[PDB]
Amino acid sequence: SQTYKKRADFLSNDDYAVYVRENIQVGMMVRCCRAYEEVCEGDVGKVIKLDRDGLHDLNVQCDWQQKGGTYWVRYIHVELIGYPPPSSSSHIKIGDKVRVKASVTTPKYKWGSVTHQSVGVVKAFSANGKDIIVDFPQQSHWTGLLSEMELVP
User: Fold this and answer.
1) 10 Å Cβ neighbour count for 33?
2) Which residue range(s) make up the domain with 116?
3) Order of strands, edge to edge, in the sheet holding 60-64?
4) Domain shared by 78 and 106, yes or no
5) Which residues does the UniProt record annotate as the domain CPH?
């Protein structure tokens, strides 16, 4: 997994912004490292558009998982995650319909009343980012390991 530097690896926002600019690509996962307007720190976003304006302009449009929608940020607002490897985590947003992957025989936090046929709406991410809380028709407030969860087609 190609690891990227964070703001703490540079002397100045300008430095770090240049690094992000040099490395960020549409499709990349990024983490918000400096809260900005609708994007809280720690929100994770898929870059959906890059504008190439001034170094500190609102050049990074992501689809933010916790915000649940798109928001433009500056380079210094994000730290690059990159292209997570196959399935290791998917781009799932609050508000998305998810289901337990068929590849999961038993979810980390048990099935409860959820089946593979259950379709739930993501309502929150755990503080560690590894878990989502999902409201299924059969069971609200169901916690799943995000890695065992997938968007419903």
Assistant:
1) 20
2) 97-151
3) 69-73, 60-64, 44-50, 29-32, 78-82
4) no
5) 7-83
* Residue at token pair 């690891």: 3
CATH number at residue 66: 2.30.30.30
In a domain, 91, yes or no: no
Burial class (CB in 10 A: 0-12, 13-18, 19+), 142: buried
- The Cα 116–Cα 78 span in angstroms is 35
Rg of the chain taking only CA atoms, in angstroms: 17
What is the sign, positive or negative, of the torsion defined by CA atoms of 87, 9, 128, 65?
A: negative
Residues 105 and 78 placed together within one structural domain of the fold: no
* Nearest-angstrom CA–CA distance, 64 and 77: 12
Give the experimental resolution in Å.
1.9
- Element housing 13 (H / E): helix 13-23
**DSSP secondary structure letters along 25-89:** -TT-EEEESS-BTTB-TT-EEEEEEE---STTSS-EEEEETTTTEEEEE-GGGEEEEE---TTTS
Count of the separate structural domains present in the chain:
2
Distance of CA 70 to the CA centre of its chain: 12
